[PDB]
């Protein structure tokens, strides 16, 4: 069965820890050749309303009060991944306790 709070919380805490302490050094170096200044970088000048709507807002990159570069956008993404993994584990356990064996015998 597995209780939902412990599984969900452990999955999202582990995923956030992997995002901050593990994958963050690998982050900002995969975006270096992705949205870097040397390459095309920005895609829109921002002249009219639609062009500046294409332009990034001043909310996702203003500052990083964390010691690392872990912004709240990365917090949301890694928390979504953790919720996904926790619900996957809960779903597998739910199928397991129902008397159904999905694995090859």
């Amino acid at each position: 069965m597995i209780e939902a709070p412990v599984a969900i919380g452990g999955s999202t805490v582990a995923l956030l820890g992997l995002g901050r302490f593990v994958f963050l050094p690998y982050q900002r170096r995969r975006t270096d050749m992705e949205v870097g200044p040397g390459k095309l970088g920005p895609k829109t000048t921002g002249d009219t309303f639609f062009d500046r709507l294409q332009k990034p807002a001043s909310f996702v990159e203003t500052k990083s009060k964390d010691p690392s570069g872990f912004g709240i956008i990365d917090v949301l993404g890694w928390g979504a991944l953790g919720h996904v993994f926790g619900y996957f584990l809960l779903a597998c356990s739910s199928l397991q306790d129902a008397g159904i064996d999905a694995f090859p015998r």
């Binding site: 050749m33 992705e34 390459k39 095309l40 895609k43 709507l53 294409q54 956008i73 990365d74």
Partner: protein, 74 residues
Amino acid sequence: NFGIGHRLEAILEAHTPPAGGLGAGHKGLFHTVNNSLHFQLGLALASVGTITSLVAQHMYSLPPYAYLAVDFTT
């Protein structure tokens, strides 16, 4: 506009096979697709035609609607 995601042009630039298997690879294709409406039109029509063929080949073998297999003319 957020700080995460994938850039299509960067993915097209990166997917160039080494040792000159595909030459320059998929580079320069982002502007080719974006500037040409007919490229996107051909891709869309090809994919929708493939999907329509899939619908035809899967509806008769797997009838999704009740009392549809008995209706032969339909």
